[PDB]
């Protein structure tokens, strides 16, 4: 079942065996991945997370971050920690309470403390449209047409060496898959559907790193939805989802009555289905339970290339067509070395005081904040360009904007930039050697937002900076709860931190 609007989430620790293999994790409602939490549009969520962890090695304080929602005038209920609150300190519980207004689509909640999302915190989160502009394109979209894609660790995150390239073990469709090594026929996911219907498919990335090729044997894609933004119909063959990313596809249930493989090939670790890894099944209603016995293509003809997107509205482009044709066009300075990102020459460490908290308390400008470097202003009301060019080692990098959705203006591995009709989404490929992806979005939602790489291991190796937007109006527009004024004074009493 789903759960939501309003609801309690407990969060603990449990062993699980999703590839055959038990280890300890950090869970949400007792299941890897975590329940879905879904309401409408424009409903109130009140979220309240129950901090249950007693295992340090996984860290017993949590914080939750509601991926690709604006938290207009909530920014106090985000959940990056140390950017819009201290931590959840065990034993304790915090409502998220917040709005979505204007904001229908697919979803999902992480922790956001450290790397503990790859330790077992991941769910979907699914805000339906009961007027959705898609729902004459088919039959069936509930909590049985969610398709989730994770990587799995053996080693606990806590043990993962700063700014390695680390490796999963598993990748988990629906939760279930077969490890790369040591390979045993554990049970793998069943995706059912009857023949002739049509089906929402809500593909959602939970990964803390790796990329996927996503496909079905015998059967295409019908991409209506990226990001949470509608798009005009696309069909494909093969769909490349990046880390956070989601997609919503028609799946026609058109082919004979039978198995079918579905495939998710990641870019690091296990390489092919040898076994059944990367691997999970559909099957029509009436197939005889075994196994799929079909063949992926050599090449896919149909791939998804993200500049064939377009939004199904009319959204635009902000701003004037050219480079640098924005109030504020800023182009970010991307590194990696020795270990450590930098963005614009500084390595994102998490300040002690939270950024909203510094912002409460009187710092207003953004050489006042901390960390030093780490911190830019945005002015209220205004176009912003961000420019992303690629290098860094470690990419394809997937970097995603809290707060806000964006126009990708230029795309990965693509010259050319759109400033007429492109997708707007939350997470963008940034490509390669090169490259210059940018982004543009206004200025409408005062607060301090999260500018990252999704792969979990760069952004706890530094690959962050704070967008501090409309640094004047932040206290009026963001009124706290006293539960979020009492969480940095409960943080640093259990810690013995003074502040
Ligand atoms: C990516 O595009 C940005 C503009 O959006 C380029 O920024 C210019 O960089 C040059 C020096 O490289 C400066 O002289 C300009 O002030 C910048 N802004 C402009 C022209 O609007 C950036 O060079 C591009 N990067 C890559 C790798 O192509
Ligand atoms: C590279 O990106 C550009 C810009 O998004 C794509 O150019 C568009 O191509 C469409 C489809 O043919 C035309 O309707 C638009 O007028 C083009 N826009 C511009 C600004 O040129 C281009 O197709 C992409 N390249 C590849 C190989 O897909
Ligand atoms: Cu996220
Ligand atoms: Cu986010
Ligand atoms: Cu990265
Ligand atoms: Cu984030
Ligand atoms: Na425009």
């Given at each position: 079942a789903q759960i939501g609007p309003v609801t309690d989430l407990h969060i603990t620790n449990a062993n699980i065996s999703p590839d055959g293999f038990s280890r300890p994790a950090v869970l949400a409602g007792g299941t890897f991945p975590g329940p879905t939490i879904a309401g409408n549009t424009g409903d109130n969520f009140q979220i309240t997370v129950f901090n249950d962890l007693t295992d340090p090695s996984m860290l017993t304080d949590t914080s939750i971050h509601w991926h690709g929602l604006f938290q207009k005038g909530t920014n106090w209920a985000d959940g990056p920690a140390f950017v819009t609150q201290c931590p959840i300190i065990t034993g304790q519980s915090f409502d998220y309470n917040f709005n979505v207004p204007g904001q229908a689509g697919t979803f999902w909640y992480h922790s956001h403390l450290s790397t503990q999302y790859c330790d077992g915190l991941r769910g979907p989160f699914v805000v339906y449209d009961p007027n959705d502009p898609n729902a004459s394109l088919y039959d069936v979209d509930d909590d049985t047409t969610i398709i989730t894609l994770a990587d799995w660790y053996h080693?606990?995150?806590?043990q993962e060496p700063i700014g390695a390239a680390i490796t999963a073990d598993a990748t988990l469709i629906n939760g279930l898959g077969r490890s790369f090594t040591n390979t045993t026929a554990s049970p793998l996911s069943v995706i059912t559907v009857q023949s002739g219907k049509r089906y929402r498919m809500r593909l959602v990335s939970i990964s803390c790193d790796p990329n996927y090729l996503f496909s079905i044997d015998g059967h295409d894609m019908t991409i209506i939805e990226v990001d949470g933004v509608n798009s005009q119909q696309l069909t494909v063959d093969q769909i490349q989802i990046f880390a956070a990313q989601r997609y919503s596809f028609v799946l026609n249930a058109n082919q004979p009555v039978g198995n079918y493989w579905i495939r998710a090939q990641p870019?690091?670790?296990?390489?092919?289905?040898?076994?059944?890894?990367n691997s999970a099944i559909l099957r029509y209603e009436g197939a005889t339970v075994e196994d799929p016995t079909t063949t992926a293509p050599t090449?896919?003809?149909?791939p998804l290339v993200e500049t064939d997107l377009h939004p199904l509205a009319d959204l635009g482009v902000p701003?004037?067509?050219?480079?640098?044709?924005?109030?504020d066009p800023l182009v970010l300075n991307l590194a990696f070395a020795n270990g450590r990102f930098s963005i614009d020459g500084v390595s994102f460490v998490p300040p002690t005081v939270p950024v909203l908290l510094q912002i409460l308390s009187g710092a207003q400008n953004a050489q006042d904040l901390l960390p030093a470097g780490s911190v830019i202003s945005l002015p209220s009301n205004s176009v912003i360009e961000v420019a992303l060019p690629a290098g860094a080692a470690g990419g394809p990098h997937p970097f995603h904007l809290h707060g806000h959705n964006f126009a990708v203006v230029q795309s990965a591995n693509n010259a050319t930039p759109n400033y007429v009709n492109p997708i707007w989404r939350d997470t963008v490929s940034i490509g390669g050697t090169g490259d210059n992806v940018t982004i543009r979005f206004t200025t409408n939602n005062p607060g301090p937002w999260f500018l990252h790489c999704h792969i979990d291991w760069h952004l706890e190796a530094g690959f962050a900076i704070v967008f501090a937007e409309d640094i004047p109006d932040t206290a009026s527009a963001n009124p706290v709860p006293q539960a979020w004024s009492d969480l940095c004074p409960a943080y640093d009493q259990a810690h013995n931190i003074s502040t």
């Open positions: 080693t606990l995150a806590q870019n690091s670790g296990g390489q092919g289905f040898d076994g059944g890894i090449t896919f003809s149909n701003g004037q067509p050219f480079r640098g044709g924005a109030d």
